[PDB]
Amino acid sequence: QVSSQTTINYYRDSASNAADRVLQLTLGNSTITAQEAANSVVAYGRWPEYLRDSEANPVDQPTEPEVAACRFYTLDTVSWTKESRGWWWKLPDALRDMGLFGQNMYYHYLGRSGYTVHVQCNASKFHQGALGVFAVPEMCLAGDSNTTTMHTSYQNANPGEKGGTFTGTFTPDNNQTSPARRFCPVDYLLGNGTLLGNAFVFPHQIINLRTNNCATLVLPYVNSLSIDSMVKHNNWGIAILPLAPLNFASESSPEIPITLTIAPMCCEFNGLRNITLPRLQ
Amino acid sequence: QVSSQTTINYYRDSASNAADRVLQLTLGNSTITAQEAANSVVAYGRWPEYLRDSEANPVDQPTEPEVAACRFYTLDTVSWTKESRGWWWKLPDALRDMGLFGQNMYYHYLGRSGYTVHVQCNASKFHQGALGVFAVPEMCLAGDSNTTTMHTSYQNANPGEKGGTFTGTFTPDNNQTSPARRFCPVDYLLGNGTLLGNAFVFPHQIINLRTNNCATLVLPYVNSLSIDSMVKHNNWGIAILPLAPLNFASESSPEIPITLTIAPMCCEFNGLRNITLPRLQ
Amino acid sequence: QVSSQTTINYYRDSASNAADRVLQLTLGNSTITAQEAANSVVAYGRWPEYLRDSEANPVDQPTEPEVAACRFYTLDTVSWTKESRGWWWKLPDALRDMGLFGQNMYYHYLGRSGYTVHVQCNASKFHQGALGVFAVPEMCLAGDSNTTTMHTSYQNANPGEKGGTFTGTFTPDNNQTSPARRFCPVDYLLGNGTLLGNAFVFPHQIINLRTNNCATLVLPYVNSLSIDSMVKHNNWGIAILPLAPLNFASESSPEIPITLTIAPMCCEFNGLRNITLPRLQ
Amino acid sequence: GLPVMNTPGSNQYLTADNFQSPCALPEFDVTPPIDIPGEVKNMMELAEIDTMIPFDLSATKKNTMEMYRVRLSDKPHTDDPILCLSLSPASDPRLSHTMLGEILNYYTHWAGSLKFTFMFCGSMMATGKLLVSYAPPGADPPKKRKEAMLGTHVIWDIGLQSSCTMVVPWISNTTYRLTIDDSFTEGGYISVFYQTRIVVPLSTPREMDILGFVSACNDFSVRLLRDTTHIEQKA
Amino acid sequence: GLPVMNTPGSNQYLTADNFQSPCALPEFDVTPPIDIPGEVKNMMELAEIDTMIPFDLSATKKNTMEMYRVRLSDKPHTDDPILCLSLSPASDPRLSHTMLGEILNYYTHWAGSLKFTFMFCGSMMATGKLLVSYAPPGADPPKKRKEAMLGTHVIWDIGLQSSCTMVVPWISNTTYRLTIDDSFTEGGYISVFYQTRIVVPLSTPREMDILGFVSACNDFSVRLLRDTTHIEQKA
Amino acid sequence: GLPVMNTPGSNQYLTADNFQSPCALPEFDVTPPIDIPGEVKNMMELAEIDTMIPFDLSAT
Amino acid sequence: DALPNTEASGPTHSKEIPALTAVETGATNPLVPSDTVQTRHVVQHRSRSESSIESFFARGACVTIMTVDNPASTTNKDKLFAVWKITYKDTVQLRRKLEFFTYSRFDMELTFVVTANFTETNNGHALNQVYQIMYVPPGAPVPEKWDDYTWQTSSNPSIFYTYGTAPARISVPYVGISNAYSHFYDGFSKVPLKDQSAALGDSLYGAASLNDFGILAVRVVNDPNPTKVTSKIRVYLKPKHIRVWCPRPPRAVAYYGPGVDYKDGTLTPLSTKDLTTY
Amino acid sequence: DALPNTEASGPTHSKEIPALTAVETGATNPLVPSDTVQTRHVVQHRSRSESSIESFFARGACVTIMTVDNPASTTNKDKLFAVWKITYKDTVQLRRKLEFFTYSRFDMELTFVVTANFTETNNGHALNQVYQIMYVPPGAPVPEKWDDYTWQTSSNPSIFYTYGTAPARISVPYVGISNAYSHFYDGFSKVPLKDQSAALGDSLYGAASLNDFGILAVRVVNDPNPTKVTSKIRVYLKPKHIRVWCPRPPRAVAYYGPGVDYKDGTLTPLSTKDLTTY
Numbered sequence A, B, C: 001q002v003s004s005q006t007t008i009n010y011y012r013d014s015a016s017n018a019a020d021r022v023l024q025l026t027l028g029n030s031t032i033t034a035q036e037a038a039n040s041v042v043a044y045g046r047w048p049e050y051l052r053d054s055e056a057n058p059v060d061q062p063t064e065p066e067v068a069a070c071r072f073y074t075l076d077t078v079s080w081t082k083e084s085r086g087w088w089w090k091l092p093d094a095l096r097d098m099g100l101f102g103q104n105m106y107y108h109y110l111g112r113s114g115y116t117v118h119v120q121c122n123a124s125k126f127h128q129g130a131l132g133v134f135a136v137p138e139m140c141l142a143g144d145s146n147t148t149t150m151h152t153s154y155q156n157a158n159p160g161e162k163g164g165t166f167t168g169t170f171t172p173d174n175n176q177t178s179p180a181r182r183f184c185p186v187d188y189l190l191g192n193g194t195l196l197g198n199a200f201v202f203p204h205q206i207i208n209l210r211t212n213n214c215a216t217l218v219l220p221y222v223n224s225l226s227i228d229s230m231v232k233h234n235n236w237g238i239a240i241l242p243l244a245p246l247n248f249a250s251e252s253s254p255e256i257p258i259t260l261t262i263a264p265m266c267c268e269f270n271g272l273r274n275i276t277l278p279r280l281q
Numbered sequence D, E: 001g002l003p004v005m006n007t008p009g010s011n012q013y014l015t016a017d018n019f020q021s022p023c024a025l026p027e028f029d030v031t032p033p034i035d036i037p038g039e040v041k042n043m044m045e046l047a048e049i050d051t052m053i054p055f056d057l058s059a060t061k062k063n064t065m066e067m068y069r070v071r072l073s074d075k076p077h078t079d080d081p082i083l084c085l086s087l088s089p090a091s092d093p094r095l096s097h098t099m100l101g102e103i104l105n106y107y108t109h110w111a112g113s114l115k116f117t118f119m120f121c122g123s124m125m126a127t128g129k130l131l132v133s134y135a136p137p138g139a140d141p142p143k144k145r146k147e148a149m150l151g152t153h154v155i156w157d158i159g160l161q162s163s164c165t166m167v168v169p170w171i172s173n174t175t176y177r178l179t180i181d182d183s184f185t186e187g188g189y190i191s192v193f194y195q196t197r198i199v200v201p202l203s204t205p206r207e208m209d210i211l212g213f214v215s216a217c218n219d220f221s222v223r224l225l226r227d228t229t230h231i232e233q234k235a
Numbered sequence F: 001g002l003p004v005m006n007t008p009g010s011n012q013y014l015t016a017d018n019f020q021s022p023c024a025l026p027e028f029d030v031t032p033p034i035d036i037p038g039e040v041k042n043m044m045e046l047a048e049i050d051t052m053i054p055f056d057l058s059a060t
Numbered sequence G, H: 001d002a003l004p005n006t007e008a009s010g011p012t013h014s015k016e017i018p019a020l021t022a023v024e025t026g027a028t029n030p031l032v033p034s035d036t037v038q039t040r041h042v043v044q045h046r047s048r049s050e051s052s053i054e055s056f057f058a059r060g061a062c063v064t065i066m067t068v069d070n071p072a073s074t075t076n077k078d079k080l081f082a083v084w085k086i087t088y089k090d091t092v093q094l095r096r097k098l099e100f101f102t103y104s105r106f107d108m109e110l111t112f113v114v115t116a117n118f119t120e121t122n123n124g125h126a127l128n129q130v131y132q133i134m135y136v137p138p139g140a141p142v143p144e145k146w147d148d149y150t151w152q153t154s155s156n157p158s159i160f161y162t163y164g165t166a167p168a169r170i171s172v173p174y175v176g177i178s179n180a181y182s183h184f185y186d187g188f189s190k191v192p193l194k195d196q197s198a199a200l201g202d203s204l205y206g207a208a209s210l211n212d213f214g215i216l217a218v219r220v221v222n223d224p225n226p227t228k229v230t231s232k233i234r235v236y237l238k239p240k241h242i243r244v245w246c247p248r249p250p251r252a253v254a255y256y257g258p259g260v261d262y263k264d265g266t267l268t269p270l271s272t273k274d275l276t277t278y
């Protein structure tokens, strides 16, 4: 084969070769409306899809809850005080005690699912601030102990719907007798050790209180595996960090609440058995 | 490929492969006449041309002054006494305080231009001498200090329209406290360190007072770059050296004046901004 | 290329590849007759020819004397006594003071020419002997000093028309103060250091007094160069050696004379200038 | 056998040669690829994603969220630049660690048009105008609005849309620029000034904040891969 | 695998071999070439450009402008040569440093027709005639006009045109000449004489000057590249 | 001869390479194969034959 | 590929206002220079070939240094054969280049460069050594002595490198059990169940057997000489046919172990620079 | 190519007078031998192939000598790795050949020839050494120790040469940022502005980053032996596919540094010769 600028393959094995404001969306029995939402982000431009047999690893017939699990669950609300650094919720670990989705993911061994995350935070025309919502895939976070690595515990690494928080400054877990085994992600490093500024490479939106009060993210199912355990592996992760601090009428104690509404989409399960009863506290 | 006296390329990358007297010329509002000019030299046989988009690096719309800058500016006159070794003017550094061309080159960041240099020197039938005008490209000149290299200053290396002179004999700048950082080009070495005799490889003409009293050189724009800063890089350089000394009626003090008239041709500029105000004295 | 008993050339450069009695002849105004000449030898089977432009190095128009120089010049005569070992004349050095050929070769820088050599020696039916005439190309001869090599002088290596002689036995030039720088060629070694018996490889004839009294040799122009200086390089060389000694009627003092008649043929010259006046004595 | 001749360059390990080598796991069945969302087929695709420029790398703010905020105000109009930065995307301390800068620091040549976006994270009643100017090199850096306008400039209205894009064009004598702070291959300067001061009504915050963003345009390109100085394996 | 047999000449570095080697910068995008005036596609193109012959390499004049001037006069006619030089373009001290000589000193063989031009840098009223003679080697060098004319010669009239060209033809026994002063491959001699003395009217300078020029003709050629002795890296 | 260039990985013995080597018994006549019952053309064919699971690997 | 040509442009007075956008959405502005400036036509020659994934990764990088000695038989100390667990997280440069992206399918090409040196002051003689480099997949027995049965390489592929020849080299296909190498893994290998001992189910965070590729054991085949000879095999890893997915932000602070942890004093990547200073 | 045939000529009596010309113009006389002499027809065989630009430059030339040692571990002195800034201005011959012309686009071919030798009187033993030759483009970190992270060559191309084998060799395309290498540059990299400190803007004359190609770092990979071993890498540079522009006059006096400066006592190139003397 004479290629343009003589390529002959001598080895059978291949490895040996050479080198917009208005929005209303309905999922099941749940409906979401937002008159000042600045469009949606289809993360990586891929809508969630059911597993296709062409790339199907397991054989067992999949149980798709459909309406009973592809609903919008509103996680708890969090106050965005002036001196707040951020929050992070891992998925689907957040939807583990939410309706029938939690039951299905605990009962079934393997499970895949996309998500639709709607972050809601509204302020008056006289408020001043801006949030950034990033859907970090495979979101890891740094530990708190400099004497050990990858030492975080299951209970502390999976807060649930309560979520987690970013700390302004790192603080080693100096306790050498009973280490807390707890995440200590620095806000500007984003926890992973990278920089916040570059974090925009991830699928993201910005809730700028002057322009929009909502942020919609359609997160597909990204994973090295077509289907994987939901109780072990947390595919995505939502991180909400305030790019610019809240401010209002020269008032030093302004608070506004931020809410999340997550809807599993095209969620499929396999491998039914006794129900997982994990230790979380 | 069986080539005449088997050539097979094995590597994708290409680098891996194997191996006449009368003249009258008008530019803008300026006209030049010469009844005894011995034709013109189109240096390297290339007439100046506007930048062609096929080889255009910058994107900004180019400002071509056209008539306002493509005029004949007459630089100061210089006396060709018997004991004078030569002169040298760097371009476009000479046309830096000449009309609107200086303003355009100082205001605009990048600028390209060809030139038309008319050297005028007339003597009686009873005069005896001969000048050689060479348009040295990338004309460098040797420094004056043997203790340092490339130490010349911007102010001294860009005399302006006053030009420079060739010295008969080298003289080191022995001052080690405050070096003059000044060119000291020896006349016969041409400054660069080469020999004068070979200097005819450059585009050149000879003003032989018996035959002709003028020399016209059409210098195109030669440079490694399609367009380059005019305040830093001096593309061409005119060097006038007397091949045979002036002589007249056995008189030991004969003087005649030599004048230069330089006309930028097809001059284009890009990158407008605050005006350069360089330090020159 | 599959050659008979795969030849592929990989290198562009070619060096890198793998591996009869009656005779009468007229030249110009000269005529030669011989009723008992045993035919002629066209040395190497090539008749002398004028230089062909296809292999012409110089550009200058060639001066061909034609009749004025392509004549038969009879060099001096030499007695073939019983105890004589041989003679040798170098060409064209022999025809250096012969008519207009000498003038042309001295005036012109480069010159080429073939020759026609007629060796004449006649004896009665009662005489007994045999000569061998060899036209040695590039005829070199050994020096006389064992303390130095290639030390012969121009004057001694170019005797002229007088010719040279072969010595029976070698004799070193023991004089270390003023070496004679003179040829001392041993007869049986032929001078070059080879053997006489093999000397028949050269173009040759034999003058056997019982059969023939003449020997004709048409010598072409052989040389590494198409045309070469005639005053420096002596192309050919005639060597006459008696294969069998002269004898006559039991007489111990028989002499017969041998004559040479040389005719330049197709002689061409180039590069005219002041006349060479060499030092010869 | 066949006659050969080992040319120079034999029995050497060059770490940039595409030579076939024997497989150590013959017949090894390979897990087929699957359509994973987000396949990147070129590093430039990453350079074209906006990332915040840590503008205020000064004293306290450095290495803290505050470094990403450029603080405006309601002060009376002034010519002093709001912000300034040289267009050295790979060596400028502010642009060095942006995604564009991180990708550049792996290549020694770059040539293209940059895209500086600015977002105004302020109140809805805060209206004003700004001048975002790019001045090529070779002259005094702009220090007043008087000199900045003479170069490329864009007037950003902060009325409703919170963002403004300045496409810094490709002005260069060389066809490429070195990724090292270099005198010959300078990039130029970029500055932000007040054209018309920010005017905020009463009972409204009086200290805005603008966030920068730097990305490559669709004509960008780099070459001559190299190593990066941002990471060191201590000992 | 294939059976081979390393022939002699393997694992050697020959500095004149055209062998393909792996690229150390794969996929490296290359700045396209642009039409730069003055592209030279052969060194002979440089040998064909006239360059002044430093004739008077004597005592004071050597290594000074004066070395390029050949001084004529108004003296009564004489047969003594105005100037003389052997046609050893690569080893003659006068022709060694001319552009033709500089190019030749990188090759050990040369063969062609030379072109000696002379320009008369004198007054307009200075009229006269000169004899420019080339005499091939093998005889006494010319020392009087009597002997020079017998060779090639050209009579130069200095009336109006200031220049005269003598095409020294290619007379050689060998097809090439060595670039070293050699007895066998001599080039010949060139001389300039007064045919008719320079006559200048009154109130006119009485000391002219003629400048030489040496170049190769369109049939010139060289071969067998070598090193030059004109440059030494001291220590 | 032909110009070559020994790439890295030469003069090494990799125990998983299919390279032709000279025969030490040239022209050696080979006993022809015969149809022997039970030719296995893949190791998986052996994995598909039932075999008793030693369940009670306990003590005695 | 020839990048897009920079088309010409001129003065405009329209109301499309492409310059102004809104960053609140997750779509970057596709604005181009022609839109906000008077631009001249320019034929485009630059190509992004050098910056593709292959050209970005088409270079071997050192991933480990394995020390193996041949102690003199005079000294009773046993030979030191090197067992190195296969991973690209021993170094930083290759790790940092890979951790731009989240998933990656790439064939691999490993090159072994060996060097040797005497250690005892006695300038003795050591005949040319032969090194065995054996790959032990996950589960196969790990050699415990330099001269035990496991070195027979009955099924484990192995390379015999004669010191002084061209460095060893071998290619390998994509060996991941999953459909792409997982540079990052947010999860565990066990779930601590509510009805079992705490120790059981306790597994390191972000640790999974997806990156379980076995070990690589290197030994000096030669039996010991009278003079100790040390050697250091360097492994250079080139990804071929590499495809990557889900980009990420490059590491800013120095690594700390296999995870995404960072040390206490390393959290100061950026440098001082006044806001208004060119 | 067959040069023009030397056509024949004869006596003439015309008035064209091609022999006389005027050198005042910048056009050389195209006169040929047939015009001024009676010339005979001559078939022309000579060709100018050997003198073309490629054949004139198709030969590698030494451009540097880099000294790298492997000091004995007995002596505490650290190893000496050689960092050589890439340039052809260390020598003269290649520099002088290139400085005929003003601009040049040429692919390059670099060949490294290594040699070694013991230094201590003790005739000890040193096992075959492996040299690393790493290219550090402009900006990439410069190795400061022989065993620091920078030697991982994660992105910097590098060659591992096993001493005693065929000399190393690699080709490189045209890497100039401009459209042709600038042998000469009349100008500066900064313009001293009238309103700033004198030190700022002060740059060396004729110095620009056009010739900024980074460094080349060579080290001995082997950890130190008991006996010091010195080595000297020689780099031979061959221009391939070379095109040159704007010829110039060759240097006459000995070089002095990178610029066009000449030393005080070197200004006497020519030699004594009387005017009238053959």
Ligand SMILES: CCCCCCCCCCCCCCCC(=O)O
Binding pocket: D024, G086, G087, G088, G108, G110, G133, G134, G135, G157, G158, G159, G170, G172, G175, G181, G211, G213, G216
């Ligand atoms: C030592 C000789 C035989 C070696 C056989 C090949 C060794 C490598 C096999 C496993 C490689 C898989 C892991 C590489 C990619 C990664 O970890 O990202």
Ligand SMILES: CCCCCCCCCCCCCCCC(=O)O
Binding pocket: E024, H086, H087, H088, H108, H110, H133, H134, H135, H157, H158, H159, H170, H172, H175, H181, H211, H213, H216
């Ligand atoms: C040492 C191993 C890898 C080396 C990679 C190639 C080294 C050369 C790359 C830059 C060359 C550019 C400068 C050469 C031409 C010049 O300066 O005129």
